[PDB]
Amino acid sequence: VEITYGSAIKLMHEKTKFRLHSHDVPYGSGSGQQSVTGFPGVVDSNSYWIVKPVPGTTEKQGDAVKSGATIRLQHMKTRKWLHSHLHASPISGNLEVSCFGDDTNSDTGDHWKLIIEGSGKTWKQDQRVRLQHIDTSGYLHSHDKKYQRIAGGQQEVCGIREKKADNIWLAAEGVYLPLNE
């Protein structure tokens, strides 16, 4: 259950049970970058993310991710980074959450602080967490607000500034690399 750097995870929205999801299609407005949504179905390779450190650092694959760590989530299928910035999200006009760059292109807008809700010190499967975007201070957020025509039935994912029930997430369905000890 200990989630280590290098591990593959799904991230489930606690309230709606939808999974953090991406795919090879951009937003029409805001940044025009690759879009990110909440996806309800269980079988979906597009729901997998790799937990990574920021490139400068001592943290390595197999190290436990700590509460308070700055992390990156890289989409397995497209290699783009979970990203935010000051653009309007398409449904609710909150902070746009996108997929940015690739293996040669990452910036600080790819940085999220892991906040474990209890007194837990290392990230585990099924524990309640928030992810706070470093640059904007937006909490990764979803809700029962859905696209209709393209990607219909999938939920908006965005960033908001207050802690709420709709910004708690749980890591699930993961493959966790062995603990360096």
UniProtKB/Swiss-Prot annotation:
Entry keyword set: Endoplasmic reticulum, Glycoprotein, Plant defense, Repeat, Signal
Protein name: Stromal cell-derived factor 2-like protein
Subcellular location: Endoplasmic reticulum
Lineage: Eukaryota, Viridiplantae, Streptophyta, Embryophyta, Tracheophyta
Subunit structure: Interacts with ERDJ3B.
Role of this protein: Involved in the endoplasmic reticulum (ER) protein quality control and unfolded protein response. May be involved in the quality control of glycoproteins. Forms a complex in the ER with ERDJ3B and MED37A/BIP1 which is required for the proper accumulation and function of the surface-exposed leucine-rich repeat receptor kinases EFR involved in pathogen-associated molecular pattern (PAMP) triggered immunity.
One GO CC annotation: endoplasmic reticulum
Domain MIR positions: 1-54, 62-117, 120-174
A Gene Ontology BP annotation from the UniProt entry: pattern recognition receptor signaling pathway
Mutant lacking the gene: phenotype: No visible phenotype under normal growth conditions, but mutant plants are insensitive to seedling growth inhibition in response to the pathogen-associated molecular pattern (PAMP) elf18 and show increased susceptibility to phytopathogenic bacteria.
Induction trigger: By tunicamycin.
Superkingdom per UniProt: Eukaryota
Major localization listed first in the record, in broad terms: endoplasmic reticulum
List of glycosylated residues: 180
Presence of the UniProt keyword Disulfide bond in the record: no
Record bears the keyword Repeat: yes
